[PDB]
């Protein structure tokens, strides 16, 4: 509800690319995460099935191959890339209150520099942690107390792959848009 | 019942070692197999336990590690080493019936030569098939359809080892007794 009012405040005090394309893509990712993707991961552990009679083997194998869920990583990423925009708004509101270019410049050019770092950091984590963007149907697990190697089966691997590729692609576009914003301000000096 | 009458007929028409020690040890092995050992192997497959949820993995793993049961091998061995003695008895009875040294010599020296071969053959089979005379608590099985390698547990491994060593030792003694019988007839020529 009030989030729409928040967007209008953040909509102002930005450049053409920043006003429209960055904000639309940011809302785009939130909608995908909230209304569509969150129920795909609902039964991630409930429907995780292992071919064994060993008690506790299911708990350790799921924890080994999914140290942190994909949706939790995306939730953290959205929070981190949204804070520098929120910090600017409070700084401007604080600045206006005390009133009744250089300071504005350095705050703005720093905020879009942190967003690029955060986007690239989480994008790198997704790759190393899950060795690619495709989820497998079968995982082989040999952690204690599983005897030898145990076959375990993931829930909805194909649908999770579709949303993973979707979220990564949009994040890559947001990186390019922020990079161009730097170039526009770089040549203007 | 009538088996006791059979022994008395086989008791006669033999040499000192053959009359007593071979026949006593032969009865010795039958008693061990019948009254003691046969109920040790009763639950060999019923109590065979594998740590898996794969249907049919228990059937193939038991069949892989126990191609033929120990008690069935001993039953076959006793039958084979007993036939040459039975063949002599019918030959003598046939010979006596037609009546109303060389022939007796060659039949007798051949019969104790077949017993040595049969005893050594089955003794060799026990070794190669079961790689020693000690039964293990744990067997690792990777035959289809078992996924990867599956742990399976044998029933009464220690008691089966005790009877295995017992039967092998008595068979080894019977080999030596038959060998000496050859030496006694060899020097006499």
From Swiss-Prot, chains A, B:
* Localization (cell): Cell membrane; Cell junction, Gap junction
Q: What is its main location?
A: membrane
Molecular function as annotated in GO: calcium ion binding; gap junction channel activity; gap junction channel activity involved in cell communication by electrical coupling; identical protein binding
What is any Pfam family matched here? Connexin
Q: Which residues cross the membrane?
A: 18-37, 71-91, 108-128, 162-182
Question: Which annotated residues bind Ca(2+)?
Answer: 39, 42, 44
Q: What is this protein called?
A: Gap junction beta-2 protein
This chain is encoded by the gene named GJB2
């Amino acid at each position: 509800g009030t989030l729409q009012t928040i967007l209008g405040g953040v909509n102002k005090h930005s450049t053409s690319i920043g006003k429209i394309w960055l904000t639309v893509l940011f809302i785009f990712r939130i909608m995908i995460l909230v209304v569509a993707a969150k129920e795909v991961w609902g039964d991630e552990q409930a429907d995780f099935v292992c071919n064994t009679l060993q008690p506790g083997c299911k708990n350790v194998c799921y924890d080994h191959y999914f140290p942190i869920s994909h949706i939790r990583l995306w939730a953290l990423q959205l929070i981190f890339v949204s804070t520098p925009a929120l910090l600017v708004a409070m700084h401007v509101a604080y600045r206006r209150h005390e009133k009744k270019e250089g300071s504005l410049w350095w705050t703005y050019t720093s905020s879009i520099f942190f967003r690029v770092i955060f986007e690239a950091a989480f994008m790198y984590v997704f790759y190393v942690m899950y060795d690619g963007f495709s989820m497998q149907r079968l995982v082989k697990c040999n952690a204690w107390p599983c005897p030898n190697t145990v076959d375990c089966f993931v829930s909805r691997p194909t649908e999770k792959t579709v949303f993973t590729v979707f979220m990564i692609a949009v994040s890559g576009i947001c990186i390019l848009l922020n990079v161009t914003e730097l170039c526009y301000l770089l040549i203007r000096y």
